């Protein structure tokens, strides 16, 4: 779909930014349920 920004506290002991907010870019992908219509079954061979 697209991108937006996030704000969140950071959990990273040792870091200068432990327990501090950071702003971070994120992507969003549209994800309606997938529908299951088939099964396909593979076998091992000396040719792959």
């Amino acid at each position: 779909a697209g991108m937006t920004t996030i704000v969140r506290d950071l959990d990273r002991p040792g870091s200068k930014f432990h327990k501090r907010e950071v702003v971070e870019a994120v992507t969003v992908v549209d994800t309606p349920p997938v529908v299951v219509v088939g099964v396909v079954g593979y076998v091992e061979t000396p040719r792959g």
Binding site: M3, T4, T5, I6, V7, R8, D9, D11, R12, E21
Partner: protein, 48 residues
């Protein structure tokens, strides 16, 4: 699904969002919601 079981610390961190930006990407978005935009601006020559 990832091909390995990362331990990274960076992987493993359990984030918890605080705020998701939601202003218009179609320009310099000043407002999260139409409600917020009403608040700040007041009545316009359209409107009620």
């Amino acid at each position: 699904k990832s091909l390995y079981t990362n331990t990274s610390r960076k992987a493993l961190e359990e984030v918890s969002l605080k705020w998701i930006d939601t202003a218009s990407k179609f320009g310099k978005g000043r407002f999260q919601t139409p409600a917020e935009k009403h608040a700040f601006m007041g009545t316009l020559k359209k409107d009620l």
